[PDB]
Amino acid sequence: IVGGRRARPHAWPFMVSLQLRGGHFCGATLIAPNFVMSAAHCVANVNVRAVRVVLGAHNLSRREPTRQVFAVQRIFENGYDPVNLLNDIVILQLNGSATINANVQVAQLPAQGRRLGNGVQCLAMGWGLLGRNRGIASVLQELNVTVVTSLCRRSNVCTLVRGRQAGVCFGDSGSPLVCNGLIHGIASFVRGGCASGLYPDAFAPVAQFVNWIDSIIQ
Numbered sequence: 001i002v003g004g005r006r007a008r009p010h011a012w013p014f015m016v017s018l019q020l021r022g023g024h025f026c027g028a029t030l031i032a033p034n035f036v037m038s039a040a041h042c043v044a045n046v047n048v049r050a051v052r053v054v055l056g057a058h059n060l061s062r063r064e065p066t067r068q069v070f071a072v073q074r075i076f077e078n079g080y081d082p083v084n085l086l087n088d089i090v091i092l093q094l095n096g097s098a099t100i101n102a103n104v105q106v107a108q109l110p111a112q113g114r115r116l117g118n119g120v121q122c123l124a125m126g127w128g129l130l131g132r133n134r135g136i137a138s139v140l141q142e143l144n145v146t147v148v149t150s151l152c153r154r155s156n157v158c159t160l161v162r163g164r165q166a167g168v169c170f171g172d173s174g175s176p177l178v179c180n181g182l183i184h185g186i187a188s189f190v191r192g193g194c195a196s197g198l199y200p201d202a203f204a205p206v207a208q209f210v211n212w213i214d215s216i217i218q
């Protein structure tokens with residue numbers, strides 16, 4: 001996250017870190033005791049057998065007893081087009097069920113077809129890069145964004161930080177976009193570099209896939 005702030009410890013217990021031998025590379029969202037969802041372009045190019053699903057984390061630099069780590073058991077896609085990043089969503093079945101506690105909880109999804117109007121206030125988050133020569137985040141970052149329909153495909157939910165250059169970046173892909181306590185978006189791609197101030201950040205529209213998500217996690 002570029003231009004964000006540190007999140008409160010375990011403020012978003014559904015936040016997931018996808019890691020390859022201890023190294024963070026994408027985010028995800030716990031949508032069931034044994035299901036997370038992320039961006040399809042996160043798992044499409046990595047070795048899935050080495051992917052580790054880290055739940056209940058906050059600072060990736062430190063040992064954390066609150067962490068629960070799982071492996072991927074099966075992959076579910078829905079017409080993922082890697083060329084245009086269309087339907088950039090993926091569901092990962094875990095090799096077990098997570099233990100629900102104060103630090104690990106299931107996220108809430110909106111209804112199928114729910115559209116977010118222009119100007120709705122949302123919150124983006126992730127453990128991604130912090131900007132040009134700003135390094136990478138160790139503590140979970142969060143950022144206030146505003147939903148926009150301009151410079152945005154109908155197959156996407158786009159957000160923009162009004163008044164300053166800020167947004168999601170590499171490593172934030174797959175992280176949730178929380179609006180009204182519901183996961184309306186999955187961080188997909190930026191344009192003109194991170195925090196460009198010209199293009200809005202594009203998210204995968206979870207609301208358009210709720211019927212497909214339910215058909216798998218139920």
Ligand SMILES: *[C@@H]1O[C@H](CO[C@@H]2O[C@@H](C)[C@@H](O)[C@@H](O)[C@@H]2O)[C@@H](O[C@@H]2O[C@H](CO)[C@@H](O[C@@H]3O[C@H](CO[C@H]4O[C@H](CO)[C@@H](O)[C@H](O)[C@@H]4O)[C@@H](O)[C@H](O)[C@@H]3O)[C@H](O)[C@H]2NC(C)=O)[C@H](O)[C@H]1NC(C)=O
Nearest residue numbers: 011012120121122123124143144145177178179180181182
């Ligand atoms: C930056 O963003 C934060 C957080 O964003 C909100 O929460 C996330 C999870 C998403 O759902 C976003 O869509 C939300 O906007 C904002 O803090 C929130 O500010 C609003 C005011 O604009 C607060 O709303 C109050 O809610 C009171 C009841 O709280 C309970 O219910 C709300 C949902 O209605 C729920 O979000 C909250 O956690 C409680 O469960 C209500 O009595 C009061 O009248 C008012 O409506 C909201 O509580 C704040 N949330 C938090 C976590 O602090 C910031 O305002 C925003 N910055 C700017 C500048 O706008």
Ligand SMILES: *[C@@H]1O[C@H](CO[C@@H]2O[C@@H](C)[C@@H](O)[C@@H](O)[C@@H]2O)[C@@H](O[C@@H]2O[C@H](CO)[C@@H](O[C@@H]3O[C@H](CO)[C@@H](O)[C@H](O)[C@@H]3O)[C@H](O)[C@H]2NC(C)=O)[C@H](O)[C@H]1NC(C)=O
Nearest residue numbers: 021048049050051052053068069070071072094095096097
């Ligand atoms: C579900 O999968 C997890 C993760 O599996 C790990 O990650 C994968 C990507 C692959 O690389 C796997 O080879 C790898 O194990 C399993 O968690 C892991 O289980 C093993 C065996 O129980 C743990 O090994 C132990 O580790 C402790 C230290 O905590 C040592 O003291 C032991 O001697 C032993 O080496 C391993 O630590 C653990 N991973 C983590 C991060 O704790 C999990 O068991 C599996 N669940 C099921 C039901 O299959």
Ligand SMILES: CCCc1ccccc1NC(=O)[C@H](CC(C)C)NC(=O)c1ccc(CC2=[S+]C(=O)N=C2[O-])cc1
Nearest residue numbers: 019020021023025043044045046047048049050051075
């Ligand atoms: C960048 C991370 C470097 C790294 C660290 C630890 C362990 C492995 C890797 N390095 C990969 O992780 C690479 C990344 C590439 C961009 C180079 N990636 C793979 O090694 C890989 C393995 C198997 C598959 C099978 C397919 S094919 C398909 O269509 N969907 C799949 O999952 C794909 C990629």
